[PDB]
Design a protein around this ligand. Structure first.
Ligand SMILES: CC(C)CCC[C@@H](C)[C@H]1CC[C@H]2[C@@H]3CC=C4C[C@@H](O)CC[C@]4(C)[C@H]3CC[C@]12C
Ligand SMILES: CC(C)CCC[C@@H](C)[C@H]1CC[C@H]2[C@@H]3CC=C4C[C@@H](O)CC[C@]4(C)[C@H]3CC[C@]12C
Ligand SMILES: CC(C)CCC[C@@H](C)[C@H]1CC[C@H]2[C@@H]3CC=C4C[C@@H](O)CC[C@]4(C)[C@H]3CC[C@]12C
Ligand SMILES: CC(C)CCC[C@@H](C)[C@H]1CC[C@H]2[C@@H]3CC=C4C[C@@H](O)CC[C@]4(C)[C@H]3CC[C@]12C
Ligand SMILES: CCCCCCCC/C=C\CCCCCCCC(=O)OC[C@H](O)CO
Ligand SMILES: CCCCCCCC/C=C\CCCCCCCC(=O)OC[C@H](O)CO
Ligand SMILES: CCCCCCCC/C=C\CCCCCCCC(=O)OC[C@H](O)CO
Ligand SMILES: CCCCCCCC/C=C\CCCCCCCC(=O)OC[C@H](O)CO
Ligand SMILES: CCCCCCCC/C=C\CCCCCCCC(=O)OC[C@H](O)CO
Ligand SMILES: CCCCCCCC/C=C\CCCCCCCC(=O)OC[C@H](O)CO
Ligand SMILES: CCCCCCCC/C=C\CCCCCCCC(=O)OC[C@H](O)CO
Ligand SMILES: CCCCCCCC/C=C\CCCCCCCC(=O)OC[C@H](O)CO
Ligand SMILES: CCCCCCCC/C=C\CCCCCCCC(=O)OC[C@H](O)CO
Ligand SMILES: CCCCCCCC/C=C\CCCCCCCC(=O)OC[C@H](O)CO
Ligand SMILES: CCCCCCCC/C=C\CCCCCCCC(=O)OC[C@H](O)CO
Ligand SMILES: Nc1nnc(-c2ccc(O)c(Cl)c2)c(-c2ccccc2)n1
Ligand SMILES: CCCCCCCC/C=C\CCCCCCCC(=O)O
Ligand SMILES: CCCCCCCC/C=C\CCCCCCCC(=O)O
Ligand SMILES: CCCCCCCC/C=C\CCCCCCCC(=O)O
Ligand SMILES: CCCCCCCC/C=C\CCCCCCCC(=O)O
Ligand SMILES: CCCCCCCC/C=C\CCCCCCCC(=O)O
Ligand SMILES: CCCCCCCC/C=C\CCCCCCCC(=O)O
Ligand SMILES: CCCCCCCC/C=C\CCCCCCCC(=O)O
Ligand SMILES: CCCCCCCC/C=C\CCCCCCCC(=O)O
Ligand SMILES: CCCCCCCC/C=C\CCCCCCCC(=O)O
Ligand SMILES: CCCCCCCC/C=C\CCCCCCCC(=O)O
Ligand SMILES: CCCCCCCC/C=C\CCCCCCCC(=O)O
Ligand code: NA
Length: 387
């Protein structure tokens, strides 16, 4: 049995290094949003809320984790607070991640009403509510769902603790049925699964809109060919009405002028078609190609480019949510083994330390994801560091 202070020294040193990086990187995120108006939007207010949770992991949760690794003597409910505080920060992160996903879904699904529905003032209120709920959920053991009524008195005596004190260790004070059923299943797993459902809807909505744009583009070009090889006015009329509906569906200044020219030219040709003048209708329909080459294809390309950027932004957000799940799931899975398999030897202490370090590393990774995936953050980071 090697001296406990040695393996402790490795765990503590790694924890302190992570805390430094979590503070530095996420302070940079907050400084960037504060300074760049192009970064000031509802999505990034939740990003800042998430960065604040990660700053508090470095300032508070990691010092608390180091403290409760020692098993020092503490009043049981004081031990409970420093043990449970990381649950507040993890819960706040989950709420911010879910809010970000929902924000991106509103933007892709109803962009015309996004600016009227999703405002900064409503966002600040949601953030406040989510922090209150995070304290309520994370500190629920302090309301009585704890093991302080049944302390490990033999462990307390062997450490010289006073009366009312326990050896302060996470699993000795926080009940495992709370950790598995309430914290993991209900408060972590269910919101992560909801997030997965939201992102599936976001990418399904984007794929559908990028299909719908190509279908309307195909309908405009296909029916142009139908008119050229038509032989009577009724075939021209049929293909023109289909073009007119495709044009109005695709419509939903230089943008409006291009579609006004298009529908007007379709109407010009339809009037000729209704009068039985096929050759004049076809010549009129040929004028549409000039409008298509100078306006309509430009709208189709820019609409595609806007959709691709929304997909890119949703993928960046989903990566962040997925990395949260990756870094936190090992701890929750270990707790499931401890709880559901009392015939299994407890996960060894080195593995507990590794799982805790991994969870804490998640508070380091988001600034790197923003830097590598969002140009506006990356360029703002560069200016902050240079200047
Ligand atoms: C403004 C912010 C930074 C203040 C942070 C205050 C923190 C560090 C304080 C608030 C409550 C405090 C705890 C309250 C009660 C106990 C029980 C005692 O037997 C050992 C210390 C312990 C566990 C305290 C440790 C420090 C503590 C967690
Ligand atoms: C920013 C300010 C307002 C934060 C206020 C938080 C204060 C009120 C809370 C935080 C944690 C709390 C402590 C947590 C646990 C214990 C140990 C218990 O045996 C006696 C009370 C005591 C010591 C609590 C007193 C109140 C306390 C210090
Ligand atoms: C993709 C990621 C999230 C999956 C992580 C899986 C990890 C957490 C799993 C895979 C194998 C698992 C271990 C398999 C067997 C045992 C022995 C048992 O006596 C205690 C738990 C313990 C030690 C498990 C702990 C959790 C464990 C390490
Ligand atoms: C990751 C997402 C998709 C779902 C989370 C799956 C979790 C809840 C699953 C993955 C592996 C599972 C464990 C696999 C094996 C055992 C050993 C058995 O003696 C008791 C249940 C227990 C401990 C399972 C509990 C539930 C478990 C931890
Ligand atoms: C608690 C620990 C850190 C909290 C840090 C919170 C940092 C708050 C920074 C605010 C911010 O960056 O956002 C400005 C906002 O965008 C204006 O519209
Ligand atoms: C002793 C332990 C006590 C531990 C302290 C508890 C910290 C709690 C909350 C900090 C939350 C900060 C949240 C920052 C979000 C700011 C933000 O998102 O701004 C939106 C913007 O204002 C839109 O207009
Ligand atoms: C620079 C940062 C300073 C940080 C200061 C670090 C604190 C060091 C004090 C005690 C650690 C002793 C080693 C902890 C060993 C674990 C004890 C434990 O697991 O519980 C008790 C149990 O009885 C055992 O079997
Ligand atoms: C803002 C800045 C925050 C400052 C707090 C920093 C560190 C707290 C370290 C706590 C160290 C607790 C020592 C516990 C102890 O038992 O000390 C024994 C004492 O020396 C004789 O018995
Ligand atoms: C920017 C500033 C923001 C706020 C910064 C706050 C930093 C908190 C640091 C450490 C918490 C460690 C607290 C635990 C120390 C417990 C040691 C102790 O209390 O030992 C005596 C006890 O009776 C055992 O026998
Ligand atoms: C039980 C409740 C305990 C304290 C709740 C902490 C919430 C404070 C500020 C949220 C900041 C968001 C503002 C934007
Ligand atoms: C949400 C807020 C939960 C508030 C929980 C913070 C209040 C904890 C007070 C406490 O733990 O009480 C000491 C205990 O009663 C002595 O045996
Ligand atoms: C485990 C503990 C769980 C505790 C469970 C109970 C908590 C209450 C729940 C939600 C409060 C929602 C607050 C709503 C605040 C008022 C909002 C408002 O007035 O604004 C309307 C706005 O115009 C629309 O856009
Ligand atoms: C509003 C939430 C209620 C706030 C009041 C929380 C006080 C927690 C408390 O003191 O309860 C001891 C609990 O029974 C531990 O064993
Ligand atoms: C996703 C949510 C998981 C919710 C479903 C969780 C179902 C758990 C029920 C269960 O495991 O029961 C244990 C049995 O009583 C022996 O302990
Ligand atoms: C989402 C999946 C939720 C729960 C799966 C875990 C349920 C695990 C239930 C195993 C409990 C159990 O029955 O243990 C057997 C007993 O120890 C020997 O007889
Ligand atoms: N058995 C057990 N032991 N320790 C922790 C623990 C304590 C302090 C921390 O800072 C961290 Cl990250 C983890 C958790 C645990 C598991 C999932 C979610 C929250 C806590 N579970
Ligand atoms: C990837 C993120 C994890 C970083 C891994 C760093 C390596 C070790 C972290 C500390 C865990 C092992 C401590 C050994 C002490 C002991 O034996 O109990
Ligand atoms: C780009 C520069 C980065 C800033 C430097 C950050 C320095 C932090 C690195 C390691 C933390 C070391 C913790 C010291 C251990 C104390 C002794 C002990 O383990 O008990
Ligand atoms: C993770 C680490 C990123 C830290 C890069 C250092 C520059 C940031 C300095 C600061 O804004 O406080
Ligand atoms: C621990 C808390 C650390 C949080 C760091 C947050 C840094 C980002 C923004 C803080 C607000 C800016 C305060 C002074 C701004 C001066 C200026 O605008 O020129
Ligand atoms: C920017 C402010 C950050 C706050 C600084 C906190 C850094 C202190 C590091 C670790 C916490 C020390 C925990 C002490 C354990 C007590 C050991 C014992 O009593 O047996
Ligand atoms: C212990 C608390 C458990 C119940 C939580 C109650 C819900 C949160 C309570 C108060 C938050 C107050 C902030 C409300 C501002 C709303 C702004 C808005 O949404 O537009
Ligand atoms: C359960 C979910 C686990 C992993 C999903 C990770 C999503 C993105 C992580 C790596 C980046 C690709
Ligand atoms: C990645 C490297 C970290 C190792 C992760 C998983 C391997 C499982 C840990 C060893 C199980 C020990 C079994 C036991 O003694 O109870
Ligand atoms: C990644 C690396 C994880 C490896 C951690 C191994 C140290 C544990 C010490 C041991 O095996 O007893
Ligand atoms: C021990 C600190 C490990 C932190 C790694 C997370 C970010 C790495 C990306 C570059
Ligand atoms: C350690 C595992 C956690 C995250 C992997 C690093 C990904 C971030 C770099 C971009
Ligand atoms: Na986090």
């Amino acid at each position: 049995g090697a001296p406990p202070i040695m393996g402790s020294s490795v765990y503590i040193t790694v924890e302190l290094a992570i805390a430094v990086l979590a503070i530095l990187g996420n302070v940079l995120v907050c400084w960037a949003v504060w300074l760049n108006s192009n970064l000031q939007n509802v999505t990034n207010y939740f990003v800042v809320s998430l960065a604040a949770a990660d700053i508090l992991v470095g300032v508070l949760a990691i010092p608390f984790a180091i403290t409760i690794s020692t098993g020092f003597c503490a009043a049981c409910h004081g031990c409970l607070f420093i043990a449970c505080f990381v649950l507040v920060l993890a819960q706040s992160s989950i709420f911010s991640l879910l809010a970000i996903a929902i924000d991106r879904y509103i933007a892709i699904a109803i962009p015309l009403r996004y600016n009227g529905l999703v405002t900064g003032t409503r966002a600040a209120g949601i953030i406040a509510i989510c922090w209150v709920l995070s304290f309520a959920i994370g500190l629920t053991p302090m309301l009585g769902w704890n093991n302080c009524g049944q302390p490990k008195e033999g462990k307390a005596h062997s450490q010289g603790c006073g009366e009312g004190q326990v050896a302060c260790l996470f699993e000795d004070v926080v009940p495992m049925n709370y950790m598995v059923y309430f914290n993991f299943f209900a408060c972590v797993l269910v919101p992560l699964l909801l997030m997965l459902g939201v992102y599936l809807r976001i990418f399904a909505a984007a794929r559908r809109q990028l299909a719908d744009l190509e279908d309307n583009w195909e309908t405009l070009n296909d029916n142009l060919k139908v008119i050229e090889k038509a032989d009577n006015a009724a075939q021209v009329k049929d293909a023109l009405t289909k073009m007119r509906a495709a044009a109005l569906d695709a419509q939903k200044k230089d943008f409006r002028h291009g579609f006004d020219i298009l529908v007007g030219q379709i109407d010009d040709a339809l009037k000729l078609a209704n009068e039985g003048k096929v050759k004049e209708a076809q010549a009129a329909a040929e004028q549409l190609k000039t409008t298509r080459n100078a306006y309509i294809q430009k709208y189709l390309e820019r609409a595609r480019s806007t959709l691709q950027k929304e997909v890119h932004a949703a993928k960046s957000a989903a990566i962040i949510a997925g990395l949260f799940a990756l870094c936190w799931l090992p701890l929750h899975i270990i707790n499931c083994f401890t709880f559901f398999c009392p015939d299994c030897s407890h996960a060894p202490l080195w593995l507990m330390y590794l799982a805790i370090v991994l969870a804490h590393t998640n508070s380091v990774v988001n600034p790197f994801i923003y830097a590598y995936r969002i140009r506006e953050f990356r360029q703002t980071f560069r200016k902050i560091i240079r200047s």
